[PDB]
Design an enzyme around this catalytic site. Structure first.
Site, PDB file in Angstrom:
ATOM      1  N   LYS A 242       0.862  -1.216   0.000  1.00 30.94           N
ATOM      2  CA  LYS A 242       0.000   0.000   0.000  1.00 30.94           C
ATOM      3  C   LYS A 242       0.887   1.252   0.000  1.00 30.94           C
ATOM      4  O   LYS A 242       0.686   2.125  -0.865  1.00 30.94           O
ATOM      5  CB  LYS A 242      -0.945  -0.009   1.205  1.00 30.94           C
ATOM      6  CG  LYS A 242      -2.030   1.064   1.206  1.00 30.94           C
ATOM      7  CD  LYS A 242      -1.713   2.276   2.066  1.00 30.94           C
ATOM      8  CE  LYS A 242      -2.051   2.097   3.534  1.00 30.94           C
ATOM      9  NZ  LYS A 242      -1.336   3.084   4.379  1.00 30.94           N
ATOM     10  N   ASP A 261      -6.280  -0.773  -0.208  1.00 31.57           N
ATOM     11  CA  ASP A 261      -6.578  -1.096   1.213  1.00 31.57           C
ATOM     12  C   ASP A 261      -8.097  -1.210   1.350  1.00 31.57           C
ATOM     13  O   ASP A 261      -8.783  -1.152   0.320  1.00 31.57           O
ATOM     14  CB  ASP A 261      -5.978  -0.061   2.166  1.00 31.57           C
ATOM     15  CG  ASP A 261      -6.656   1.297   2.121  1.00 31.57           C
ATOM     16  OD1 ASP A 261      -7.512   1.513   1.229  1.00 31.57           O
ATOM     17  OD2 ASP A 261      -6.327   2.128   2.982  1.00 31.57           O
TER      18      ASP A 261
HETATM   19  I1  LIG Z   1      -4.878   8.035  -5.254  1.00 25.28           I
HETATM   20  C1  LIG Z   1      -4.482   8.433  -3.238  1.00 25.28           C
HETATM   21  C2  LIG Z   1      -4.856   9.643  -2.680  1.00 25.28           C
HETATM   22  C3  LIG Z   1      -4.663   9.856  -1.327  1.00 25.28           C
HETATM   23  C4  LIG Z   1      -4.108   8.858  -0.532  1.00 25.28           C
HETATM   24  N1  LIG Z   1      -4.215   8.909   0.874  1.00 25.28           N
HETATM   25  C5  LIG Z   1      -4.110   7.871   1.754  1.00 25.28           C
HETATM   26  N2  LIG Z   1      -4.338   6.635   1.319  1.00 25.28           N
HETATM   27  C6  LIG Z   1      -4.422   5.630   2.202  1.00 25.28           C
HETATM   28  C7  LIG Z   1      -4.763   4.282   1.629  1.00 25.28           C
HETATM   29  C8  LIG Z   1      -5.748   4.208   0.492  1.00 25.28           C
HETATM   30  C9  LIG Z   1      -4.318   3.940   0.231  1.00 25.28           C
HETATM   31  N3  LIG Z   1      -4.285   5.728   3.531  1.00 25.28           N
HETATM   32  C10 LIG Z   1      -4.051   6.991   4.011  1.00 25.28           C
HETATM   33  C11 LIG Z   1      -4.000   7.177   5.413  1.00 25.28           C
HETATM   34  C12 LIG Z   1      -3.849   8.427   5.939  1.00 25.28           C
HETATM   35  C13 LIG Z   1      -3.701   9.531   5.113  1.00 25.28           C
HETATM   36  C14 LIG Z   1      -3.731   9.394   3.758  1.00 25.28           C
HETATM   37  C15 LIG Z   1      -3.932   8.125   3.162  1.00 25.28           C
HETATM   38  C16 LIG Z   1      -3.684   7.675  -1.124  1.00 25.28           C
HETATM   39  C17 LIG Z   1      -3.883   7.457  -2.472  1.00 25.28           C
END
Ligand SMILES: Ic1ccc(Nc2nc(C3CC3)nc3ccccc23)cc1
Ligand SMILES: Ic1ccc(Nc2nc(C3CC3)nc3ccccc23)cc1
Ligand code: NI
Lengths: 312, 307, 310
Positions: A242, A261
């Site tokens: 991830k 995720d």
């Molecule tokens: I396209 C895109 C845009 C924003 C993000 N943001 C985040 N993505 C994830 C998981 C879903 C992969 N977990 C986070 C936890 C906390 C803060 C930001 C996160 C990822 C991919």
């Protein structure tokens, strides 16, 4: 606090330059606090202040223009952004890439995207410094935007060079590997509330310096193919599939990277009726990444960002 | 003399009315929702299009369906009756909505804002070649193909403003040696061959229109199987024709769009991704849930999904 | 009746208050969300209904729960003991802010939905009323059950008072529902097949289980024993037994499962059985939500139901 203040447009229009940029190609308010970068705050309405490469910027936009001002942390007098500084901002927002054309393409092959993307235009991917992106997303495990923003801010004050103070906000540059690799680093970071992530930060910094020959390694992964870069990131402490996909998409110019995720699983299952053809596992996660690359094409990560922005 | 599209206040001498609540029929939900491709709102609340080599304009109040026909006289009784047949107004939509809401909590929530969604009773020939002509993506592209097809092969009826109205071609016109070449120019691609081939096939089988009329009386299962023997007609197109032209209200056309609703809104998975057997299973599921007007309930969910 | 439904501005002499944030309790989300079927908003923001053979009107500010009670007696403001039975009914000892925090920490979907839907808590209902109410819940909606319960109470329950054109009746005792006429009468009142389960369950509790003290024993008994015991009653299966457990027998971990919970679980959580609705898959889905949310799973469910019904 500091006698020096956050600029607005029409407080100090002498110090602002503009880049021609439709609000349809970029909405600051959808891109700067949507969990890509954790270093931008709206200090006054429509005015976004944050750090790029040991310089503080304020950003605001009209319907057709991106207005930027830069604060330098030296003797040099208050001056409007240079050409080279404007070009690094053009690179940061990857404005070479036509979002209008991509939105068209995704809408043509995906009826769900077409319905949802109408109200959420100007969602694009920032091109982040690999170092900042890696250690930011190592803090992303079991976390939300608000808590990570805190950890990154405290991490930068503790380990990063002081740049300038505007109002009651002291701006620090992102730490180099040497600062995060030091003997005190883990103890200090644990006090700043990183928890278990503090170990991954110190260990990954040490690993890149000693085992991989410094930050030039992260630059090599920017040039390397998606698959090689992803595998290489996954060898780092605290970096799984991830986090490696986040870094690939947001810093290593891999637009096809689809970070998977529980959040992407939920969208895929609810909105696309997808189940694995083989609940979340490493192999099923990879399968779901492949599904979205097959559906959207080589900018699948960018299409995902539009769906995330629209879901929030 | 230059003839114009009529409105209800402009020429009320030439309009007749059918008593019809807006809850039993909403023209704006039924006439451009991808059942028929021959109705346009040429002025606000006024729907103009072709029925059986005659042009009509339709508009409604809360309690009345107002219709005018262009052949200067008001619609006859027999002409009003063909319009009553076309909207199948014998069928109580209030009773059906009640029944579906009683057995389906999801339907009850969604159908509130989307009343008066019913199935048109279409000419089988027009319905068959309309739905053969579709890549089955968008309303706009098919509307274009059908319009150009009718100008090229159908009799000129009348001109209103800058709109020239043609009747739907007969089978003989679509079966001709030129038919495929012409239809290919009109952008049908390989589907142009299935149009000519299906026209030839229907003519060969007893009387052309009389065969499709036999399927209207035949049971759903026999009619569906019979349509599937035609070039370019599979289970989805055969179910569209069954529901929209052959008086089979239980026909449930299944594709990725129905799969999405079924899975998201009903939690349905096959008990045996889309396959021929799973598609049939999903059709059976909706017949089991909604009863013998399952196709009509589906139309309400489509109308409510698209908005 | 010459006696009228009170509002807070009309007769403020007769109202008492309980300190209660709108974040700990929203009357408008709790009193007609299908827990109790005995509360109606007779005037805006003013909820009137029966507790234990007494009529109440309830309304709230941002920080206060305002209550008035109608008892023949001298028109008087609620007593301390009467306020305490209302504090018990809304289980205000339980911190909803802390529970919301805990559920949001382990469930991203809950966190998104619970922002606009705060103050959803479980009423502590009389077991008898809850049992016979939820026996009428099979193949039913809130509006139709509210009707059946109202008609059932007028037919079999003691008259308490009339306010405007509304006659308030207490819930019947078991003896009244167990009579030879009971099923015929209840069928006329539109209960259908549920009329049989009501008479039979009343007879069963009296003859086989030694009266309403049995339902009080199940309140003290562990969740699993109470659930199995309820399932021995005519018209009480796993779903109805879980409703009663959660809403009247102080089992906060009870998760009533039916097609409605299946729909939420599948759409909003991507849950499939690790094996369509069956008895075993229903139990599996109940276990899933207990595993996710912990020992107040039923309370978390109530928040999602209140948010789904809007
Ligand atoms: I396209 C895109 C845009 C924003 C993000 N943001 C985040 N993505 C994830 C998981 C879903 C992969 N977990 C986070 C936890 C906390 C803060 C930001 C996160 C990822 C991919
Ligand atoms: I936490 C909670 C909150 C409200 C309710 N309400 C009801 N739950 C059910 C099925 C879904 C369990 N069916 C009903 C039928 C009619 C009226 C009320 C009902 C149950 C559990
Ligand atoms: Ni599923």
């Amino acid at each position: 606090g500091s006698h020096m203040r956050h600029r607005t447009l029409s407080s100090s229009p002498a110090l602002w330059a503009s880049i021609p940029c439709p609000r349809s190609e970029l909405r600051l308010d959808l891109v700067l606090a949507s969990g890509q970068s954790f270093r931008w705050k709206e200090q006054s309405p429509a005015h976004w202040s944050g750090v790029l490469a040991d310089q503080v910027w304020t950003l605001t936009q009209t319907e057709d223009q991106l207005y930027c001002t830069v604060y330098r942390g030296d003797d040099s007098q208050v001056s409007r952004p240079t050409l080279e500084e404007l070009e690094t901002l053009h690179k940061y927002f990857q404005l070479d890439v036509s979002l209008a054309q991509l939105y068209s393409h995704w809408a043509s092959v995906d009826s769900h995207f077409q319905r949802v993307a109408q109200k959420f235009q100007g969602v694009r991917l920032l091109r982040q410094d690999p170092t900042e992106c890696l250690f930011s997303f190592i803090c992303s495990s079991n976390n939300n935007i608000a808590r990570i923003t805190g950890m990154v801010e405290r991490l930068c004050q503790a380990f990063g060079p002081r740049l300038i103070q505007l109002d009651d906000v002291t701006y620090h540059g992102f730490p180099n590997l040497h600062a995060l690799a030091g003997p005190e680093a883990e103890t200090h970071l644990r006090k700043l509330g990183l928890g278990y992530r503090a170990r991954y930060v110190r260990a990954s910094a040490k690993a890149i310096l000693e085992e991989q020959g410094g930050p030039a390694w992260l630059q090599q992964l920017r040039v390397a193919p998606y698959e090689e870069a992803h595998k290489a990131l996954c060898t780092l402490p605290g970096v799984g599939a991830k986090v490696a996909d986040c870094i690939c998409l947001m810093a290593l110019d891999k637009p096809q990277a689809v970070p998977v995720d529980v959040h992407v699983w939920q969208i895929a299952h609810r909105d696309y009726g997808w189940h694995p053809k083989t609940g979340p596992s490493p192999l099923a996660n990879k399968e779901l990444g492949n599904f979205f690359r097959n559906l959207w094409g080589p900018y699948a990560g960018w299409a995902q960002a539009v769906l995330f922005s629209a879901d929030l």
